[PDB]
Symmetry: D4
């Protein structure tokens, strides 16, 4: 897997907040974020377990790759405003982990290309 | 209308190395053809340590129940767990995740050709 | 193939009184006929406080899926939750429980006759 | 509800211990415990959530009733031996809660009778 | 111990809230609550550990005694309003447990008397 | 309260371990510990909530007074061997907190005297 | 180490509040607090793990001097007003621990001096 | 701070296990580990809070240097056996966090040298 890593991000939201969260991301947010970060493995909300939670997993070639990409995203005024206006009010708690794939785990997703965005 | 189960096992200290070794040598060849859609199998490097995290795709919760029941009843799987994984386990939990509209689609079922390759 | 869903809600401090009042006055008449088999609806006196605990029985997973989908699509339920219950909520969790062989069978389905006899 | 109370007991077990736990109770333990305590509302193991967990709810007419029935159970040599031999090795953590029914919650299960035990 | 019990209540407060919580009980709240419940073993705030936390231990003869006295307290409008106005804005999370004394643990205090309120 | 402090120590034990724990401290443990540390406010085990837990509260003049007395107890071979033989096998988790009494909270108990032990 | 002690304070903040927290401390707050408490070993915010969290470690000669210095800090209206206006709205949860250094851990750092400010 | 990071590692130990833990690290372990990782900011055990816990903070120039140096330590048989024999029996739970220093936080300490 050549030092590939996966960041799992886990956000606890205000009660019944996941629906608006996903609405913002599908309409606006994921077009900002996915081209920059690159390799979305999955973006979910919880149905059974800890409720009002969003779970998303992103693949990077290594930690440096993650660092460079998250800094580019963080420096985007469009991203900053999008979060401030739409997502910030829904947040309660945030946690992340760095996950390393076992040898039989699937390979990294390919990088999101602008043709993928046009295909949505 | 796919669903994803996330299973989160906390292991005994420094037990992730052996845990992965058993699954590559023997365990995943039993488990993956039965459950069908492995999205990711990981161990933590930063955060809660000595933890393995695995995400399994199913068409719905009934599909999950049937497939897990098939696995659970296999003596090969039972023996595999007893002899190799059971002593490694400390805590287990799971959650059911629902993909957002832009999240990647339901993967194909693991095939015999995938194993032999 | 019976399953029981346990739902555990942590409320804002001292919020259970209003929570149960809403469900007595309005809420349970909406929810219980749809979901079908209430096993119990409680609040805590010892343990984690400002917590409500409710268990709902279903014949199977698909029975749960269909009945919860009906409930959540009802605009009367959506508005009830939003106006009365959502401001009292702090945290929500649920578990899927499977009954051991000796555990009681499912309650019968809630009938209009039951609602009328309240 | 005439001061009715419900005790929820939540036991976390050794990994994959619920099967043996259930076996011991269906074969032997519940025949001891249910007639003494009186009103089993439900006895479960988890399938989604915290795994290796058993959840059981017992109904009592009031706090005196619960104390009296539990004291009788704890004093029984048969119960003490059954727990020590069969259940004690499977236990990791135990918690309980005292629950109060809302007005619309079902009434107490009837007391378990010998006629119930015989036709199990 | 003649089979007495102790209830430990643990309240997590909004940040830096314990000083005001303590002031409300010193000026007003404990005069309402302590004569009704009976036997305050201790009322504390945390300095090391979980911060912004108050811990209080109440003695009772048994769980039925506890439920009778707490019912009396909760029915009092003066208590309900004292809590609602002053304490409720400070609360974040609440928990309790029932503790049984070991045989060498001290006896539980006598009941709070009106002479104690006036002293 | 003259800067009085209280330490609450919370020990989670192996299941059904509190009975044996209490027996050991009744017969021998508390006779070593209480004179040295001085002011036992309460020593309990849990009945409802987190089960298999012991909770004990000790009063001190300050955190230095806590440090000196605990340092004395910890150095005692009699206490080291009692804990190793009888208590250590029963322990699962240990935590402690420093609590400050509110103005209306009772005063600290007096120092345990040898007369008390008699 | 002659009974040197370290206090670790752990604050969970409102989401995305660490940036404002650090800004208030770099511009105003740390100039009040550090000269009084004396020995800042580290002030951090989390990047991986529990997010929106600030971790800070304060060294003291002992718990008596910790108490004396913290009581001085807390009685300062400048500190009180700084916290009420700038930090209070950002706080969600606070915890602390008392840590004892192992023999090989770095020694007690020197007091922060006006020349350092 | 030039992208410096700090790793905080938090180990929960078996009851009363911190004394033996420290003894091994002072007698044998920290001689192995510190020269390799380079920048120990602090190595502690708890006295008040969660008990039977050791907390240690390691400085790194960035996560890339962290990964390089930890990979070097992990591959050392001397470290592997030291851990397996002496420390693993004391461990119950492990967690870690990546901490970023604020502008006023102390700088990256120097690398540990064989003279030290």
């Amino acid at each position: 897997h050549h030092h590939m890593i996966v960041e799992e991000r886990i956000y606890d939201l205000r009660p019944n907040g996941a629906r608006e969260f996903a609405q913002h991301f599908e309409r606006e947010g994921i077009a900002i974020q996915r081209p920059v970060l690159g390799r979305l493995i999955g973006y979910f909300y919880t149905d059974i377990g800890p409720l009002n939670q969003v779970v998303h997993l992103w693949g990077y070639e290594d930690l440096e790759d993650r660092a460079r990409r998250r800094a580019i995203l963080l420096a985007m005024p469009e991203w900053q405003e999008y979060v401030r206006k739409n997502i910030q009010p829904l947040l309660v708690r945030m946690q992340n982990k760095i996950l390393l794939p076992m040898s039989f785990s699937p390979p990294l997703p390919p990088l999101w290309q602008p043709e993928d965005e046009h295909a949505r």
